[PDB]
Amino acid sequence: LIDEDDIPVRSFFPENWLWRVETVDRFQILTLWLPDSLTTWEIHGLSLSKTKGLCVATPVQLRVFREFHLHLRLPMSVRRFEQLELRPVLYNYLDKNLTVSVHVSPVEGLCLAGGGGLAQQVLVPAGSARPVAFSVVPTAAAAVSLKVVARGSFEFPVGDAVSKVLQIEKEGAIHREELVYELNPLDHRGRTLEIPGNSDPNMIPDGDFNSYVRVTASDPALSPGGVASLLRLPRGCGEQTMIYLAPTLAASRYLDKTEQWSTLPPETKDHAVDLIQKGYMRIQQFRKADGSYAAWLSRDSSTWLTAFVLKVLSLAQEQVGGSPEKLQETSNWLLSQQQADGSFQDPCPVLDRSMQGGLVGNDETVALTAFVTIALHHGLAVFQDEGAEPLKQRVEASISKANSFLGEKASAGLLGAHAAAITAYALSLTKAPVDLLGVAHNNLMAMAQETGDNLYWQAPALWIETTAYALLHLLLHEGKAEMADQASAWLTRQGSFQGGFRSTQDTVIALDALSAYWIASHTTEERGLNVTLSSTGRNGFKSHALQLNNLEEELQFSLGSKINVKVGGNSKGTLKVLRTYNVLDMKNTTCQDLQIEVTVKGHVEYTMEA
Amino acid sequence: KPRLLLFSPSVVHLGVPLSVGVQLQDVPRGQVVKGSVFLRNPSRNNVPCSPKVDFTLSSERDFALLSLQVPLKDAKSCGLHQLLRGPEVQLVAHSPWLKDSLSRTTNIQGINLLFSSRRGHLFLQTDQPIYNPGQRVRYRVFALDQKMRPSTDTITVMVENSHGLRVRKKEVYMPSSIFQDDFVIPDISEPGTWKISARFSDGLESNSSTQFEVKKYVLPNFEVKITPGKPYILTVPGHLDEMQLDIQARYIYGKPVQGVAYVRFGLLDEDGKKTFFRGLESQTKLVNGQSHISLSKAEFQDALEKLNMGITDLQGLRLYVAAAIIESPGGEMEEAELTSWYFVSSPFSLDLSKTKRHLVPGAPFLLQALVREMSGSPASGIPVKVSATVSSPGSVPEVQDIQQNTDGSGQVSIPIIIPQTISELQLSVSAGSPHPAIARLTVAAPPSGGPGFLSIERPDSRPPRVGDTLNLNLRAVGSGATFSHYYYMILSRGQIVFMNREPKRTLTSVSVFVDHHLAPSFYFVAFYYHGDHPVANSLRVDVQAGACEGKLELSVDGAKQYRNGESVKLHLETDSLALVALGALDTALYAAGSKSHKPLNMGKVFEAMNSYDLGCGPGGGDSALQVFQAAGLAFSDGDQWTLSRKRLSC
Amino acid sequence: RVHYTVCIWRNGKVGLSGMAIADVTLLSGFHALRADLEKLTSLSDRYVSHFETEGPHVLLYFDSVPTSRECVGFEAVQEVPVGLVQPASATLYDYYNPERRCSVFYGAPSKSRLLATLCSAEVCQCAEGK
Amino acid sequence: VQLVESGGGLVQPGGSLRLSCAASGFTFSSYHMSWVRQAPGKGLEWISVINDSGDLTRYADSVKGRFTISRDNAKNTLYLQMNSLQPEDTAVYSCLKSSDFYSYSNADSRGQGTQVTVS
Ligand SMILES: *[C@@H]1O[C@H](CO)[C@@H](O[C@@H]2O[C@H](CO)[C@@H](O)[C@H](O)[C@H]2NC(C)=O)[C@H](O)[C@H]1NC(C)=O
Ligand SMILES: *[C@@H]1O[C@H](CO)[C@@H](O)[C@H](O)[C@H]1NC(C)=O
Ligand SMILES: *[C@@H]1O[C@H](CO)[C@@H](O)[C@H](O)[C@H]1NC(C)=O
Ligand SMILES: *[C@@H]1O[C@H](CO)[C@@H](O)[C@H](O)[C@H]1NC(C)=O
């Protein structure tokens, strides 16, 4: 019949055949060689130009079809040495009867029913199709290219052929091993765990090896209106100006850190900066020769107001690029006012003790010493990195001497709630030695008072001031451990009252406390869980890295023996490694649930017989 | 009382210019105002985050449009990323004229703005919609700037596994504006849907992702589609239209499939459970690739009775039909499932998303309704009845009824006369008959006693093509203040692309030439000042898709009878030098079991362009601020400001 | 003239809970006879319940599949000598889940179901020839 | 992307002439290579395209089997053997550079080629 070489062979059956990006000078013609597949090719385009822009094109439905075509649909999965049936169907769309001769060529690695190119004849009439079953068993190992040749009769020749590669899966089913494991970087035990190597006896020694590792990571404010209203215009004497300035700076800084300026109009922010600048000038002109900062020039100095001014001005030094050496003189003046044991005298009390806060009482020296130490530490930032070195060294010496005094006084106990709170914060802020830090913190713990859920210490000016100082200490003392969270909540409710923060010292301290707490809670860490895999495989020693800062990750690693794990970071996650290998599995060949058996009785003619 | 107005979109996108509009109000005609505009974050001591701009607006030409460059480096330097309480940046205008002349508290006026790093458009194109494990996946990503012009910024493309696990992350410089990559699916991959995500490296939430399904498939030879007679099945009491459906099996090359179709029916509820029928399976020989099958009323009732479900229970259950066509003598079978038959009382569906709320007393309330046939394209000639009941605060609520027919594009623009005393308007719309589809909404008039109201009236009421100048009629409905001019601006994709003023007259006609800069839709915000307070009323305008101006035309010499191995010349035509990306896919792959997700087409492109739109709703607003908020604008007149958007979405 | 005997049963109690479709494929070279096939359907006791035969392919829709073993047969008309000796095949599908196939093979009356292939523990070869 | 080609010259039919062209300036193993015949009066019909890796190849029906393509990435050289040359094959053959193995753009990157002739 038709010569097998004469008939064209169809072998290129791509699922996608035009994946080029090219430049067109408004007109370009590209020739296409249609793949040997009988389908409809939905050609689509996408033009990108620097002038016009993206412009999708109308798909060009290209239909490729043949009159008398042979269709061969190989099964996706075929095993070796197992009965396989081929059903290439011949389609006859021509307007005449056809006598075809379908035969699979004798390709090595395949086991035809006849064993060779034995022509099989079939009658396919016009406008109809007839399958031609061809039973084979694949004896090869990797793949075999089997072609089908349909030869028409001598009088009416019509040729067609189809070639495909039949990939044979390796012996045995597919087996996947799951090793669920946890990751606790904080844990001091099990950090460098190991994965046992594969030891399943059913594992086929000769086969494809694939391994994979999957790592995951699963993580578990005060009213803007009230604080804004505190941006009062400084005025009055050298003392009354501070009452209107410290809250102005505190609210300005509280909103700054809490990031609440969005709620208020943008004109408010620059209104605040103007008030700070205006308040900065107002208190500057009240400065004495040595930075005393007294209420009146005639009136002698009061270190409390000087210490308070140093604290307030030092904080504002970022907003206003003012003269820092003036403060350096003020800090120097404070040292000259330090008593032998480390306390501070303050010979002249301020006229209006209301703004002093809770200092007034049975004991004032301990609170005053701590208060000055807090301010002095705040003044360390403003000191220029160059120059004034001996003045700085004197500050660390004086503060340490006072710092040592506070611990000695604090350890004695028998001190009021206010004094303990200030000292607790002063000790922590100034980086006191641990021994003195602990005793002061322990004393505060016992004195802590509660009356309900997250209740601690409107409340009177003394209690509100005292709790604020405590909150800073707890935040600085080994972070927040569900005590600052509870204590801060108490302040938020207390500060949300109408006209909250009655006094002035409580306002500046409390606003700093909540701001410090707020920035503490809304703090996000890197949250890394990077791990590395180490093993000594047959090919050698290999390593891997899996950065998981921020999600899950997968990675293919070429390891086939026991492997080592090195967890790191601080985030807890789950690690589970997948190994895939083929196992020796054999089940019934017959059907299990539904069974069909067909038998044939009769006489069938033959042409070539064994 | 001179005033300065500051306009800018409610969201500023990092790395792209921010269009800021400023115009003087009530100037003595004898002085000029100078200054500058910049972006500053107050959390970092008011450190500017953008270079200042030449403010310089004269009294003779009050309106002026400013483009604020917002480089990425400046944003980092002033530390926006260090922000904790969400993204917030302030836009301020610095001009000493505010303090010296207006005697304001300070010489700064600004607006609270949100911001995000989402910038540019990224489109991905996988090699084919579905892969089987072990094959090589090819994909490319197109980087486009905000103006839909090709970009050259560094991008990071990452592939996510079916389980959500990243299996690739390539950070690549893409000067050509097109990046072509290709990886391989693991052979052991379990069936599922993957995802390819890309984003500009500088940005963080500027990502656009495409998905490709992976499963163990073999290319089907023919595709079978169950096309019903009607997309909807009436379930009203008493009347139940026959459920007739058509089955079509066709070889991919187009010739009819001669086989047998085995069909099984069942009810599929919202959750997904199927309640199949027993004995209802109808199998017929496909004649010319067609097999009509229907369920008679009596037998269907018996089947429901067998399941004791009852007709009354067919509220929204979806009739599930699966066909298993076996081509004979071929042998192979392909399954097709129908999941679009909703048992709905109403044959039609009224879409009233285009009617603006916030009716303006004293001006006609234009009611827009889209009469889309249920589960189908918009229909024409469906009468719609509107019964508006205007509420009279001091009299009986008059009942007004108007009837109209669909224009032909599915939309009806029915005006409604409304007196200026109405407290609120209640209207019920019913479309078609019998069993009309009814939709009811209530609109409340803005609070009375305030300043005047502005009413935008569009005589045309048809979708404007690009290059078609559409006219809007502006009318001041409140007190007859002597405001000289009408100020209006056009917002397209959250950008003020045009600002202007039109003098007041007996008739106020404004010509808005619509160009590609306005697509697929834009806003038209116009306002005037009744002495001190502002008055405004926006109007969203849906611009027709039309077509892309690139004009890429794939074409061949017809004759779609190509025998394989033949040379077919493809003609590529474009109006300018451009990068052309070509993909030739097998239609069978769309037949292979999957969700049949559509490719990239201009409908999806314009969705990306409109994805940056900030305004939500058809427009209109009870207060001047609200209309500016809903329009996606950030506005401040010194004495009145606009609250920052609480989220990136409405 | 050759008489088929198609038989189907079902262990049941799990999986199927439904009817089945038979895809019995005739030995290449001939097609099932027409008249003898309808009489399988004409009977009131209608096991086959439907059919569609064309070429060497016969499709049956067994509306019910009992636990026991039943057998329904028909004759076939021949028109061309069978080109070569080989086993044919037939499959049974589940109506509500056609994935649950049941593939089998059947040879000519004087042949064997499976190809002559001697297989060792690890390697197997064919002896298909004269 | 120079594409130097050589090996032409008139040959009696049946001479089995061999044409070879070597390329440079790009990664040869990543790009599909082809041969194109250019008849004096006709257009371009492109004979064969050896796959990126070098295994799959195509041939025009007019040369199927008669001609034979081959490549080797190591030497960046690509060959074509014209067994049993038919006097109608006389033309100028110029190896072509393209992508995706199925379509060649008009003037993406074409060589010079040599005008083979037959007596
Ligand atoms: C960019 O990626 C983010 C990832 O969070 C997408 O946002 C969410 O992503 C999760 C998947 O982790 C989805 O389940 C959510 O639906 C996404 N949206 C929201 C609001 O969480 C974001 O959609 C991506 N950008 C795109 C797709 O343009
Ligand atoms: C093909 O064979 C059928 C057999 O029934 C016959 O009816 C038909 O006429 C034949 N074709 C032509 C063109 O005669
Ligand atoms: C792993 O993570 C930790 C903490 O996130 C980091 O300090 C370390 O540098 C990381 N590993 C490497 C190799 O960088
Ligand atoms: C068939 O059933 C079991 C389960 O697969 C199989 O292992 C065994 O070879 C067969 N046993 C019987 C009794 O048929």
Numbering used by the authors:
A (entry chain B): 766 to 985, 994 to 1230, 1256 to 1348, 1354 to 1413
B (entry chain A): 20 to 669
C (entry chain C): 1465 to 1594
D (entry chain D): 2 to 120
What does the paper say about this structure?
Cleavage of the mammalian plasma protein C4 into C4b initiates opsonization, lysis, and clearance of microbes and damaged host cells by the classical and lectin pathways of the complement system. C4 is cleaved into a small fragment, C4a, and a large fragment, C4b, that act as an opsonin. C4b is covalently linked to the targeted surface through a reaction of its reactive thioester moiety with available nucleophiles on the surface. Subsequently, C4b binds protease C2 and forms proconvertase C4b2 that is further processed into C4b2b, which is the (CP and LP) C3 convertase that cleaves C3 (15).
Here, we present seven nanobodies, derived from llama (Lama glama) immunization, that bind to human C4b (Homo sapiens) with high affinities ranging from 3.2 nM to 14 pM. The activity of the nanobodies varies from no to complete inhibition of the classical pathway. The inhibiting nanobodies affect different steps in complement activation, in line with blocking sites for proconvertase formation, C3 substrate binding to the convertase, and regulator-mediated inactivation of C4b. For four nanobodies, we determined single-particle cryo-electron microscopy structures in complex with C4b at 3.4–4 Å resolution. The structures rationalize the observed functional effects of the nanobodies and define their mode of action during complement activation.
